[PDB]
Amino acid sequence: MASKWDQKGMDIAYEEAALGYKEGGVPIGGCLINNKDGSVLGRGHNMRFQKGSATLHGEISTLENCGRLEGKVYKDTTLYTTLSPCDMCTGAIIMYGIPRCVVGENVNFKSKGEKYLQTRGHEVVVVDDERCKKIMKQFIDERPQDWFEDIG
């Protein structure tokens, strides 16, 4: 199945979110996995506060840490993210042709990109991961100014 590696992918993505949370950042993590053998091409988390970055969302940092890959490689991967992607991270998935996006939870945040991915021919799976929902609920509760001055 396409979902053979989904527990591994979301577990790494959550580890990145928890790591970024301990660093004082937004707890959003991700990873990119080769669908063929489950190998991890890259992993990362939101770097808004760690690097003062306006663009290093969790999904962007994940793709940046993968490095410049061959176009054919992206076409058989799954992008795992703990939080439903914004319009920019949605566009990155579309631009690289990543066919599958697995999302931890879309309760705390959702954009039009989740539906746009399906319109553009991508598969979107929302797993409703309770670990992801809890860590982001805590961030929104404890740091509402940081959240709502950002994607909130």
Q: Name the residues annotated as catalytic.
A: 59
**Whole-angstrom Cα distance, residue 79 to residue 48?**
20
Record the tokens describing residue 86, joined without a space.
């914004």
Q: Between residues 2 and 100, which has the closer beta carbon with respect to Zn ion?
A: 100
| CB of 91 vs Zn ion, minimal distance in Å | 8
Contact status: 63 vs a copy of itself (CB under 8 A): yes
Instruction: Say which residues have a Cβ less than 8 Å from residue 19's Cβ, sequence separation at least 6.
Output: 29, 45
CA trace torsion 20, 108, 11, 121 (10° rounding)? -120
Element (H, E) at 33: strand 29-34
| CB of 95 vs a copy of itself, minimal distance in Å | 4
| CB of 107 vs a copy of itself, minimal distance in Å | 19
Give, as one character, the DSSP assignment of residue 88: H
What residues from 64 to 103 belong to the interface with a copy of itself (CB under 8 A)? 64, 66-71, 86-92, 94-95
Contact status: 48 vs Zn ion (CB under 5 A): no
**Whole-angstrom Cα distance, residue 110 to residue 103?**
11
Contact status: 132 vs Zn ion (CB under 5 A): no
- Residues making contact with a copy of itself (CB under 8 A): 48, 52-56, 60, 63-64, 66-71, 86-92, 94-95, 111-113, 120, 149, 151
- Residues making contact with Zn ion (CB under 5 A): 57, 86, 88-89
